Amino acid sequence: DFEHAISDLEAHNQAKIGVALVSENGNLIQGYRANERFAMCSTFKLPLAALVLSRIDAGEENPERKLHYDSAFLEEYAPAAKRYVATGYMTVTEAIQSALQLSDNAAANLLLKEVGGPPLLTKYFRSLGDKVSRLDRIEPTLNTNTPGDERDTTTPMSMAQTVSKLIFGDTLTYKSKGQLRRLLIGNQTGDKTIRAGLPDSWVTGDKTGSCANGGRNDVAFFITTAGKKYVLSVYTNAPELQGEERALLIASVAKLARQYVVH
Numbered sequence: 001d002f003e004h005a006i007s008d009l010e011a012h013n014q015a016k017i018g019v020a021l022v023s024e025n026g027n028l029i030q031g032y033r034a035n036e037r038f039a040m041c042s043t044f045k046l047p048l049a050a051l052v053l054s055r056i057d058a059g060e061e062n063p064e065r066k067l068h069y070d071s072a073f074l075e076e077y078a079p080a081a082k083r084y085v086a087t088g089y090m091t092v093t094e095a096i097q098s099a100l101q102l103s104d105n106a107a108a109n110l111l112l113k114e115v116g117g118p119p120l121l122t123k124y125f126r127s128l129g130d131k132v133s134r135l136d137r138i139e140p141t142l143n144t145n146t147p148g149d150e151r152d153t154t155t156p157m158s159m160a161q162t163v164s165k166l167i168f169g170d171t172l173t174y175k176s177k178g179q180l181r182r183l184l185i186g187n188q189t190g191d192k193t194i195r196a197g198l199p200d201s202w203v204t205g206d207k208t209g210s211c212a213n214g215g216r217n218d219v220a221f222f223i224t225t226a227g228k229k230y231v232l233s234v235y236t237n238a239p240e241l242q243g244e245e246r247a248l249l250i251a252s253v254a255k256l257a258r259q260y261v262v263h
């Protein structure tokens with residue numbers, strides 16, 4: 001069964017694995033360490049983008065607005081922001097696309113600045129009914145993944161439920177929900193993680209993250225050939241594995257989890 005299979009992956013890979021598979025409406029189908037805390041790492045960028053889209057939905061933000069910055073605002077991993085910095089800005093839309101599909105840390109920090117900072121993202125989690133997830137730091141220090149530190153954490157179940165609400169629920173408008181979905185489908189960093197453990201006929205979108213201390217995470221939505229809709233969150237700490245092995249572990253989790261979905 002699912003619990004025993006995940007436990008077996010833990011033992012074999014010297015890893016801690018947290019996973020939740022939920023239905024379209026956020027109801028738990030299978031989980032393992034589903035209520036234990038893990039660092040969000042870059043998975044926070046999905047609900048961050050949704051918050052910015054909610055501001056656009058509210059008429060408070062313009063997708064073409066220029067978010068200005070200079071070289072001091074750059075981060076070590078900021079492939080898009082490094083290209084645009086000479087112009088002095090990225091638009092809201094460019095920053096959303098870059099933060100989600102490239103995981104650009106300067107674009108994420110631009111958006112954190114746009115929404116009012118980590119406390120305002122935490123408020124948004126609470127507004128959605130997520131009682132657990134919390135952002136405390138900006139990039140890059142949110143990635144420290146320090147044992148016993150609750151800063152910048154979620155649980156697999158809380159993140160799965162929150163993403164199900166954003167992707168399949170009605171908090172965003174139909175326009176913004178569709179935009180978020182198409183952006184996640186075009187994610188460029190997830191080809192070897194959850195998506196690699198799902199049939200290529202299924203529509204899938206995802207947001208990955210990596211952290212210190214061997215953290216490697218991925219949260220995906222997918223729609224099967226039967227038209228059934230799911231969210232899968234996978235949080236791992238696997239300090240004894242190499243990068244490619246960490247992705248394979250997450251793919252393996254997804255293969256186990258898909259034994260419980262209607263194909």
Ligand SMILES: [Cl-]
Binds near residue numbers: 023024025026027
């Ligand atoms: Cl459901």
Ligand SMILES: [Cl-]
Binds near residue numbers: 079
């Ligand atoms: Cl790039």
